[PDB]
Amino acid sequence: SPLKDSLRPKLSEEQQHIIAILLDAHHKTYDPTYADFRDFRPPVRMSPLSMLPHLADLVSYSIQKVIGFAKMIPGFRDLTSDDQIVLLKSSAIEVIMLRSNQSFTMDDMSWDCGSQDYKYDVTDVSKAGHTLELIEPLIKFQVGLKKLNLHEEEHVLLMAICIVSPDRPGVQDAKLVEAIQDRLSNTLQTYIRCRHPPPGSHQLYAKMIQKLADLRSLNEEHSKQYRSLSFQPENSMKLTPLVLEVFGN
Amino acid sequence: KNHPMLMNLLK
Ligand SMILES: C=C1[C@H](O)CC(=C/C=C2\CCC[C@]3(C)[C@@H]([C@H](C)CCCC(O)(Cc4ccccc4)Cc4ccccc4)CC[C@@H]23)C[C@H]1O
């Protein structure tokens, strides 16, 4: 019956368009050759914070790319300048964690950016402590994300949904941010139903939103590390102007 | 919120 068919709606042309746009936006903002990494302060392994200049540069570059992606998300530009800023301040670290899954490798459980010097493992990232609260769960998070085996379309939708979250602290037009997110969420749900076969599809939407919950917790845990570190002005000195502006001083 | 750099990257 037409009545039953309307209940299971295929992906609209507008939904396919949203996906096209987010994929193009990602491809513009994520270089899988990591060529720009050569311009960062060098990684030093040999204080136990010797990697901080390099990882500061890596994060600061990655904030810049996240901003470029965010700007392309449909509807983002209709927000006020203020909500744009608060959404990006709040999400940046989570989108960086999420986008990092593309360099993460199960083989040695590290982020592999194409060089041994630009390969980052548990020993490098654990140097500033918070191993139980932040580092181990971040690695767990990277493993869980690989296990989901997302289509690139799901990956770009999840970054966008992450950014446009109405419950972020300081948001003014919560209704508008919710409406933009719902359009994205509904694209994702229909995408999964239409294009993601079982058994990988099973509960895939719910599992993806659970990854957004886990990211809120990682965000909190990193914020605690950041406040501890940055409280020593000699650490904050090794950071970048964009990191200070976006994450606070 | 005074974020000239973020604001500049946004525009
Ligand atoms: C382009 C890409 C590629 O996929 C590579 C990529 C990797 C991302 C990674 C892999 C490396 C580790 C990252 C950066 C995680 C943490 C932020 C690491 C914690 C940094 C740490 O908080 C210091 C820091 C604070 C603020 C900004 C930048 C760094 C503490 C620390 C200090 C010295 C040594 C170790 C730790 C969060 C996300 C992690 C990001 C992505 O955007």
In chain B, % helix, strand, coil (3-state, to 5) comes to 65, 0, 35
Cα A203–Cα A204–Cα A208 angle in degrees, nearest 5: 120
Contact A159, A71 (CB under 8 A): no
Contact A157, A196 (CB under 8 A): no
User: Positive or negative CA dihedral for A21, A22, A25, A31?
Assistant: negative
A-interface mutation test, from B6, B7, B8, B11, most A Cβ less than 10 A away: B6
What residue ranges do the domains of chain A occupy? 1-249
The tokens for A210 are 């659970």
Q: Which chain B residues touch A67 with a CB distance below 8 Å? A: 6, 9-10
- Which residue type does A75 have? G
Distance of CA A106 to the CA centre of its chain: 18
- Put the strands of the sheet holding A119-120 in their side by side order: A104-105, A110-112, A119-120
Centroid of ligand 1 to alpha carbon of A135 (angstroms) = 10
CB nearest A67 (choices: B1, B4, B10): B10
The tokens for A198 are 């079982």
Nearest-CA residue for atom 2 of ligand 1: A100
Instruction: For domain A1-249, say whether CATH 1.10.565.10 is its number.
Output: yes
Cα A84–Cα A11–Cα A102 angle in degrees, nearest 5: 55
Nearest-CA residue for atom 39 of ligand 1: A97
Q: Do A245 and B10 touch (CB under 8 A)?
A: no
Task: Tell me the shortest Cα–Cα distance from A65 to chain B, in angstroms.
Answer: 10
